[PDB]
Amino acid sequence: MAEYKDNLLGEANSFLEVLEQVSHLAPLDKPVLIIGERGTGKELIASRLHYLSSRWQGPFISLNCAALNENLLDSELFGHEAGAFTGAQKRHPGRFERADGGTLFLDELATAPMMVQEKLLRVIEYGELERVGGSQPLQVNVRLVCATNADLPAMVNEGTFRADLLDRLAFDVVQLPPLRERESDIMLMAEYFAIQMCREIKLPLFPGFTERARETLLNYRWPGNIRELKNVVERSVYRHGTSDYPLDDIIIDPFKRR
Amino acid sequence: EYKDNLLGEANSFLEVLEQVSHLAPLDKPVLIIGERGTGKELIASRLHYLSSRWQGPFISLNCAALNENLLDSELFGHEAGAFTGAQKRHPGRFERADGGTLFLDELATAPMMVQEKLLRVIEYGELERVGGSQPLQVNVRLVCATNADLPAMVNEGTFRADLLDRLAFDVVQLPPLRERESDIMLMAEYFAIQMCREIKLPLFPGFTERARETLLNYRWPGNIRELKNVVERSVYRHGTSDYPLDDIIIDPFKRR
Amino acid sequence: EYKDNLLGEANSFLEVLEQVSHLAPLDKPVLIIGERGTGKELIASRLHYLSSRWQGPFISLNCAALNENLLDSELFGHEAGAFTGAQKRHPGRFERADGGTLFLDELATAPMMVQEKLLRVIEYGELERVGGSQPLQVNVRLVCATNADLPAMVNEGTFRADLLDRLAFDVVQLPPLRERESDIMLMAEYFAIQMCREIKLPLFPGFTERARETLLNYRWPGNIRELKNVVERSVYRHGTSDYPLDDIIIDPFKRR
Amino acid sequence: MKQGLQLRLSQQLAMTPQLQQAIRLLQLSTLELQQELQQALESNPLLE
């Protein structure tokens, strides 16, 4: 029941809500999903579901479902008790076996390949996985949480991603709102970042913010968000490179040439 | 016996369950036809469960998920045959299934070479082997099961004609829940109860007029597989025990 | 004589039978121009079995269950462990048929590259075998067994010119099912008697007039496949010998 | 098929210089062996 807390940083009255919705499902062991756009602050949330569960005792391995080897998929996922180096006592590890009693994080689910998608399937609800070799398969108790920024329904129409896997996985999908829509925690997010930032670049103390600064930073549709705010602020700050006069200028894109 | 975890009262699922009993005795393979998510799996157990097939080790394997070489190999690959490589070769699911009821899912979506072999196995109790010529002859009772139109596939040659045309004696329907309209309510209730005993609530407070309206107007592509995800989803949206539910959710990709 | 199944009373059936006898003794490639469900390898079996040597194996099984490159693997197989997916030497398909004769199901289905491999090999009879080595030759009579107008495919260049003429040494076009007239009834009878023999029925009770009219109407897509399933399935649903058969199960997948 | 440089799996193998000598050890006759073994015994002072 212990709470990690970390950096909730939400003053949205909709991030509050976001925290509230996930909290109810934290105890739950059902498959879940997390959906975010290019700038959504979702990695913390996957941890905030498992951080808040009874099985908070469990290990929280989270694989990157996009980078696995096509060829080693069978081995990587399951693993083979015989290990290596002959009569060696060292046993093979495994993917799904190394997450019993703890939440498993799957990322880039939409991007995950057809071989991976078919391979998932059949292990999601059955609970039995058999390592290459042998005649015995052992049930694992593993909690599926999936984070994706891509739109699943469109993928289903295309046929690129199997429809059944998506349907079976996550009864409830958490909704994350874009930053242009928070619109409120920027005064707060922006300072927090900048405050960190001052010690990473080794300044003492923030100068302060011009009103204009805040006219620009409110006023913009912020394409691929949050992370975006950090970048707009972190650069702009190191840019300025001092602590006499307050911060006066922020650049949205360091592309434009001048 | 092993059928209450199914239910129904619309005469449709009634005539389905009536059918099961008569054909339960017969060991020889049957054909099971029904929509995606509508009793193929729940039904499957009942055939095995009927006293005629109750004793054996029942194995169900889906074919829509499996690969070209993998699918053929899994049913019967290198059980007795010895060849370079292929270490720790096994009999596979079909061999293990023998002496018990078997159900290989999604017969229509299978490799054409594999389909021909399957039909041969069904006929005259003979199973081919890469190693010894001696063919195994065990009366495993496995019935082919498909959801879509098998006959349509044969016209274009997608499905081997012989495999279907032989076992097109014993077809059984699983109607959608679209059609049912009576089983909805009673199932609603059952699942509901289960998700609140799951979250530790006092009591299931029932439905509203509005709830039912939307329940019964909704087209319900998915059936119990579907409905149930939705039933529980709606359960969890409320989490108190005072007034009956009036907000429900068929599409969690919606915003508000 | 292999019980002489599917006798055709109609002259067209008989003429083709006479033509087949002349063909079997000599080593000439033979092509069959019959529609699926009609002339289904029945005669293929006749033409390997009426030949000078019945000793040679009749592997057949060249249904296009393989879309492209697999067909090559199905055919000339692979070399002595060379390349990906190979663990041992695979003789394949003509080397297996050797001494005997070969049959092709929807020769029209295979890709031009496979065609081109058929033509070079047959004259010489030497086969490359994909992996490659020293040219190897064996003598096999070819039978081929397609379903649409073939000249279409060279008129729209999809069938190789030299290969097509060389391969259809001699056509044996075959009868449609609808073209058979009074042979329906005989078919019906044969199949009905065979069926009651299979299901251990005492005797056959006969037919009625209503079922007779139903058969007289029907369009009948399959020469063998469409009508045979109908009659045995009629006989299975009946399962009795006291009352004559009156009900027809026309389509096994019809609702309710 | 296709040509590529992928990876396979499932096997077992291990060896070392000293173990090797231990393995070749049983391939030769006792009389011819005892010779090899006498030679060890000059080199090693605590083995009799």
Ligand SMILES: Nc1ncnc2c1ncn2[C@@H]1O[C@H](COP(=O)(O)OP(=O)(O)O)[C@@H](O)[C@H]1O
């Ligand atoms: N509520 C928050 N509190 C603190 N930092 C946040 C918050 N939301 C976003 N961030 C910052 O933005 C980044 C979000 O990246 P991430 O969630 O991994 O993107 P994605 O979910 O698209 O992969 C984090 O590195 C984090 O520092």
Ligand SMILES: Nc1ncnc2c1ncn2[C@@H]1O[C@H](COP(=O)(O)OP(=O)(O)O)[C@@H](O)[C@H]1O
């Ligand atoms: N009456 C019931 N009681 C308990 N569980 C049920 C009932 N009806 C359906 N289910 C569950 O719903 C699931 C529906 O699966 P389904 O989509 O029919 O699989 P398939 O598509 O392979 O037939 C089944 O796995 C079954 O356990």
